[PDB]
Amino acid sequence: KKRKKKSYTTPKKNKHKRKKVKLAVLKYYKVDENGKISRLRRECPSDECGAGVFMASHFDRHYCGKCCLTYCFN
RNA sequence: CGGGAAACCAAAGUCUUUGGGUUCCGGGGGGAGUAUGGUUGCAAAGCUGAAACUUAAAGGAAUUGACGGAAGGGCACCACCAGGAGUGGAGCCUGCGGCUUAAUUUGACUCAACACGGGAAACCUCACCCGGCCCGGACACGGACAGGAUUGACAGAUUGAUAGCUCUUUCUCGAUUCCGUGGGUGGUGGUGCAUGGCCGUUCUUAGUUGGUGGAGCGAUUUGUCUGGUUAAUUCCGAUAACGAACGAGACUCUGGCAUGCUAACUAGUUACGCGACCAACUUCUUAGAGGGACAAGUGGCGUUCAGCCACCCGAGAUUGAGCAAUAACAGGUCUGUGAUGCCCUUAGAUGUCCGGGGCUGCACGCGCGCUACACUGACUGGCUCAGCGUGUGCCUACCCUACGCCGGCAGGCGCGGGUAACCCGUUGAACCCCAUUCGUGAUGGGGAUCGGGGAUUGCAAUUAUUCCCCAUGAACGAGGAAUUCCCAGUAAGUGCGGGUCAUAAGCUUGCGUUGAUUAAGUCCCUGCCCUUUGUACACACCGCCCGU
């Protein structure tokens, strides 16, 4: 009988903290400075979500989790 | 009388009611009858004879127990036996220590540990484990609000892993929470040397205890015993004991027996019955108010008592088990239980998630296990065979099973029955037998691996699940030292069913089937009990104790 001796890797770990900025700079912008503005996200043609569901942007396969939708030309 | 602590003593009496005369002599135990001085002796040694120091007892009598390589009498296959049978070595892997790093992993140190925790380890139960994350505070004090992170992406990877952990997106319940110390909603966290309750054992034997009365100053003893008898502290009897109380017996369950009884459309049936001249008042099975066996009859042994032996008769003539006395043990269990008293670690909570190394090695460190020697062992498939039992929703998603795809049958799919004496099933890949056979024993006779036919369908099985055939030839016919169990439906062979479970068994708990050589004795070994005796033991012989 010995101990588990789980020490050889990762003696201490730091909590991950996402630096989610409180200001609307990276997520959205207007680039117009007017009452009417242009939206920087493609319209979602699916009816399985709400009328204000706006998709985020990655390198590909825009990840939202609810749909896992990917733009494909079939 | 009397006296003594008593053992005992007519003296060890005439003693606190103390004085007949007189001599020697002791003052806790050791040091020590030692040192020294004197004295005697040829010598060995004799006589007289300290102290320093050391110690809380040493010692006497007796009482109970324990022990005895002490006696007497009994008893037990956890004992033995010119007795044996089967053994641990010849056919189905597990438990824990010896025993390389992720491998020898908690509790249990002879009987009273070691398929034991009903503990059959991938994993939820793995703490030896190559690796982590979602993390805890009714409060004592600290860091301060529309952000101070939650299991939650294949393709550049991870250390196996469709786990965002990649030094990665600034997707996503959204005020949920987090760090430093513990009480806490607790921890299968410690301590079973704090406990309860359950067990196990001393201890399977017959043992044990008041009341009142006797004995003793008393601890204590008698009762509870010289004998005979019994399996028995069972009885007869004896008797300073008499009356009692437990334990033993009785008792309960279970087997074994009815030209008897109570009755069954699930076993069982009678001449105005057919499908055949060419609505039995219940008995085999099932189960009930009863019966039956009492050493009852006879013979012989026994202060002619208790009882013992034998024999008819009888289904059966010490007949399976269960339950089981206070004191006991620092026996096991805190890991069965918001059954339960607090000294006290860590974030790598002994929580989850078909996820994941071992232990399924072979110079064995041990223990429980898996196995029959010949016309008896097994095939012709040529006659009606057994059980004991189990079987489908609070939880819950998991039950037992009756035809065909067809190679040759469980069976990958359709199919009905059974909450059960209704179905499985008069228990669906089974006797031990036999026109495949041994002529005197390595052949046909019982299998060393290990390969194919469709695999029950369990991710994995190999780091435990899953059939018989080609006859490929293994010391191929009573076994180191040490030994374990056992006396009639014992043993042993053999299969089957329950528990565990997913029909998971080499384990255990039960059940039938074939069927039994030896013994109706003993105290030799190991122990136990009813006495007497000894003890310088009482932590009780694993004791105590002596020696430079």
Resolution in angstroms comes to 2.7
Q: How many residues does chain A have?
A: 74
The two three-digit tokens of residue A38, written as one number: 């242009």
Let me know: does A13 contact A24? Beta carbons within 8 Å.
no
Residue A70 carries which side chain, given as an amino acid letter?
T
Nucleic acid strand B: bases within 7 A of protein CB: 102-103, 105-106, 127-133, 146-150, 153-154, 164-166, 168-172, 348
Å: A41 CA to B318 C1': 104
Which residue reads 């242009």 in tokens? A38
What technique determined this structure? cryo-EM
Let me know: does A39 contact A48? Beta carbons within 8 Å.
no
Å: A4 CA to B545 C1': 53
